[PDB]
């Protein structure tokens, strides 16, 4: 019925697994700033929402490969979460 929660679960899984694997892939490259889990979790949100401020980004092969998975899986899931919120909002747009 409300599979929007299932897409929300998949989004949180991508945000958590992405931030965990990013720190795992970035530690080892001199100059890398995506090397601590707390700020790496907000980087996953920056990538999945496509906002991308640029304060945090990968600079390694794997780290950028992890970002690709966060892009493909996160933007799709976040697009499904924000689409359900759009449908619900219209459902009251006529109950004026």
């Amino acid at each position, epitope marked *: 019925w409300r599979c929007a929660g299932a897409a929300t679960v998949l989004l949180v899984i991508v945000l958590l697994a992405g931030s*965990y694997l990013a*720190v795992l892939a970035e*530690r*080892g490259a*001199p*100059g*890398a700033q995506l*090397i*601590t*889990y707390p700020r790496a979790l907000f980087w996953s949100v920056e990538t999945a929402t496509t906002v991308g401020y640029g304060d945090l980004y990968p600079v390694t092969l794997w780290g950028r490969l992890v970002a690709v998975v966060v892009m493909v899986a996160g933007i799709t899931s976040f697009g499904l979460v924000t689409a359900a919120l759009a449908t619900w909002f219209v459902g009251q747009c006529q109950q004026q």
Partner: antibody
Amino acid sequence: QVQLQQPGAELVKPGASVKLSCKASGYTFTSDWIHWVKQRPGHGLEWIGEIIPSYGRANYNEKIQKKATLTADKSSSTAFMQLSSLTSEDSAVYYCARERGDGYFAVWGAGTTVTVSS
Amino acid sequence: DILLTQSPAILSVSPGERVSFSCRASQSIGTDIHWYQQRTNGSPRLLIKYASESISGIPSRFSGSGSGTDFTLSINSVESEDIANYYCQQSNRWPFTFGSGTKLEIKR
């Protein structure tokens, strides 16, 4: 309680290789990193390398010589640093510290005084 | 790699006076600096995390400040137990680096 336990001292022959241990107690998280810090007598703190026991992933200080190999045993919760081909310059105190993946070292070990002499 | 300079290396001070340790970074690290204390024949002990945030179990006279490249660890009023070495350590870029260390001395 003593969260990180290290052997007291290790005597190494010139050219031999020692294996140090660091048994962890307390909360064990999948995001925990174990670090190793070398302190030569009269000098300061010198970062050797790090290892995450969850994945088996390990890193080392490129700034100095890499004489170490970091390993872990998730069953017994003990990290292992294997120093090979030791010289007189390697005689120092070797600490182990636990990092929650957030930048700082919350708890340290007592250190292991490694002496290289015949 | 980020170079942490602690100047000066020895800080002599009369008891009861305010003391400040200095740690300069080779490039801006924001607020990802951490302070440690090491007494004779002892292991390092965390004093302040993230420039200013205090740790559970540290006297209130220990405080921290700074951002960018210049950071400071202050002791409001020094007593004999504060005689040790003090190190700064950054966590902004890989790898983690320590400072050169500063020794505190008291003019009793």
